[PDB]
């Protein structure tokens, strides 16, 4: 699915 990068 679409993603918007890591968040830790």
């Amino acid at each position, epitope marked *: *699915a*679409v*993603g*918007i*990068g*890591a*968040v*830790f």
Partner: antibody
Amino acid sequence: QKVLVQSGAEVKKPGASVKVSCRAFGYTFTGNALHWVRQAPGQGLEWLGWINPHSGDTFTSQKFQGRVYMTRDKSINTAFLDVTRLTSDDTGIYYCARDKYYGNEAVGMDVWGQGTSVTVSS
Amino acid sequence: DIQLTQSPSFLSASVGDRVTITCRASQGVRNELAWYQQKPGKAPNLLIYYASTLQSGVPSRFSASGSGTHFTLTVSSLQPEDFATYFCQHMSSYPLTFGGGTKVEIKR
């Protein structure tokens, strides 16, 4: 105890801008992507874009690129939606909504703000 | 934009009825699909994600099926609090889009 609290109702003239705020409580704000979705009266749901609150990266829906801007301020756990060059077709209720964000991908919108009414009219 | 076509758009039913709502995607979206309930004056509430996983806090009378393009949401026995509008949503590409909604109203 997860809650998103949005700013109050706005009324604007065509061509003006509006900045809606959305503050996260009860979870780590920077741990989940945040969507913005609007609903005109009597109509369906329209996705505006989403933001990574940790990094500030965004994807804005193509029809709003260059007009709608998503930002955040981690110091106050708050995301902002700036909708510029307003027209009456921007009238509606604007929501922020958290994604479950498992695996750093979109899964589903599990916490929603209460909505912010935006009226645009001459 | 992927189009999600829901059917029926309007449904009348009684408490205790089984309700089946369909969502058809114009392109394959794997299981990257969610379902929501919305009542007047309120934000939507998440019911189902990953096409068929039930969200915590949602009664077990809600269930869903589908992988690819043809998805269904079922309420096995409608309760008074289930009369509402239901939406599907994909997240396989941008923009995310929602179906047009199915409004379930009470028969009398």
